[PDB]
């Protein structure tokens, strides 16, 4: 098992130190960004220190790692938005290992949890809720707009109400702020009887809103 | 550097249905130097096989790969639920180890057409100067749908955005957003806001309007 530290949300120029907590083995740091592939950043083998990076980070990473609390390190530097990314550390095997000099590759595993990683000029903003009233199904919903950053949680009557939910992923506007929609459909003849109620929160801004929602 | 091509970049099939994955690599692996990983929502990538054609430990026995030189695949006997999920391949047998962009493995159902609903802003909304109005597509198979606004039967561009679910996990369906926003100012200069949609389970195009 590997144990990753939390998520970090920097400007961009700042820098970020994310760590690999083992519960050996070369530490691989791979990213993947929003909807995207994998990317291999670098490695370290974390008993004799020997580095190794690829092309595109040579200059503003370092990798290092502490035997002695067998946890590694990953530094990126001179961020930009484009370096938001889940960032994973993995172990690379040592069976059949493939060695090239002091660099070591082979299949990866166990894999850390990975560590959400946002760079934005954007400041800590709570979401505005707005109600998207019903107008022999009903649909109803909470417009959940201009928040940062992620994530917020949505749920409809405390929790009570599940069947029939969608909670879309966040898009990102361009001026930096994230919004989303939760919607649920629920029988028509429900819409004068029945209360519903979405309970939004975002915890970067100690956001908590429950908003009926009725025709 | 060795590039890695990953094909189909969709497979969509049933339960129960034989899935082969391709990953080919523009220069010749060196000697079986191969590795697949599956990734769910969420969650990190998960080693199946490696030297091409070795299961890893704990993996299902319908999991086998093979392949050498430029020409690799993937294949899942016969698809289980868990097995939807993203593939990727890597190749480590050169520097720098390289990875193919992911073939997604989907759910095939039963075609479904969207329910279309709109919603127009709030009274909340317009206080604080903004519009938004949203259109729901709910509960459909395939993917491809197309979502066009009119403003007074005027075509709008630019000025929406889309979201989408991942397959439910119950019926497998899909549901889509899309998202209008106009200054308060724009949104009084028109009467007519209508969402059209166009999807392969419609007869014809479905459009869902309201006067403001």
């Known amino acids: 098992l590997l144990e990753q530290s939390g998520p970090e949300v920097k400007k961009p120029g700042s820098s970020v130190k994310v760590s690999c907590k083992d519960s050996n083995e070369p530490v691989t740091w791979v990213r993947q960004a929003p909807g995207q592939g994998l990317e291999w950043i670098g490695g370290?083998?974390?008993?004799?220190?020997?580095?190794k990076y690829a092309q595109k980070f040579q200059g503003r990473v370092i990798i290092s790692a502490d035997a002695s609390t067998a946890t590694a390190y990953l530094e990126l530097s001179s961020l930009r938005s484009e370096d938001t990314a889940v960032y994973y550390c993995?172990?690379?095997?040592?069976?059949?290992?493939?060695?090239?000099?002091?660099?070591?590759?082979?299949?990866?595993?166990?894999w850390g949890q990975g560590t959400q990683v946002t760079v934005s000029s954007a400041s800590t903003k709570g979401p505005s809720v707005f109600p998207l009233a019903p107008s022999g199904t009903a649909a109803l919903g909470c417009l959940v707009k201009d928040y940062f950053p992620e994530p917020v949680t949505v749920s409809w009557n405390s929790g009570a109400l599940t069947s029939g939910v969608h909670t879309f992923p966040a898009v990102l506007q361009s001026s930096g702020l994230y919004s989303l929609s939760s919607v649920v459909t629920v029988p028509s003849s429900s819409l004068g009887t029945q209360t519903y109620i979405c309970n939004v929160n975002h915890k970067p801004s100690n956001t908590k809103v429950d908003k009926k929602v009725e025709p | 550097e060795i590039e890695l091509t990953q094909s189909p970049g969709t497979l969509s099939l049933s339960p129960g249905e034989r899935a082969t994955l391709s990953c080919r690599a523009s220069?010749?692996?060196?000697?079986?130097?191969l590795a697949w990983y599956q990734q769910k929502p969420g969650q990190a990538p998960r080693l199946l096989i490696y030297?091409?054609?070795s299961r890893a430990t704990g993996i299902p026995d319908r999991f086998s790969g093979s392949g050498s030189g430029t020409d690799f695949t993937l294949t899942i006997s016969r698809l289980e639920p868990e097995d939807f999920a993203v593939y990727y391949c890597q190749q480590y047998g050169s520097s720098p180890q390289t990875f193919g962009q992911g073939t997604k493995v989907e759910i095939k159902r039963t075609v479904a057409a969207p329910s279309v609903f709109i919603f127009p802003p709030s009274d909340e909304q317009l206080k604080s100067g903004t519009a938004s109005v949203v259109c729901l597509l709910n509960n459909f198979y395939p993917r491809e749908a197309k979502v066009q606004w009119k403003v007074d039967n005027a075509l709008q561009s630019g000025n929406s955005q889309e979201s989408v679910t991942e397959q439910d996990s119950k019926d497998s369906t899909y549901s889509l957003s899309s998202t209008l926003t106009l200054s308060k100012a724009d949104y009084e200069k028109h009467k007519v806001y209508a969402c059209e949609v166009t999807h392969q389970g419609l007869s014809s195009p479905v459009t869902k309007s309201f006067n403001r």
């Open positions: 370290i083998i974390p008993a004799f220190g020997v580095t």
């Open positions: 993995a172990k690379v095997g040592l069976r059949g290992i493939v060695m090239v000099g002091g660099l070591a590759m082979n299949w990866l595993d166990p």
């Open positions: 220069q010749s692996v060196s000697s079986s130097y």
């Open positions: 030297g091409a054609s």
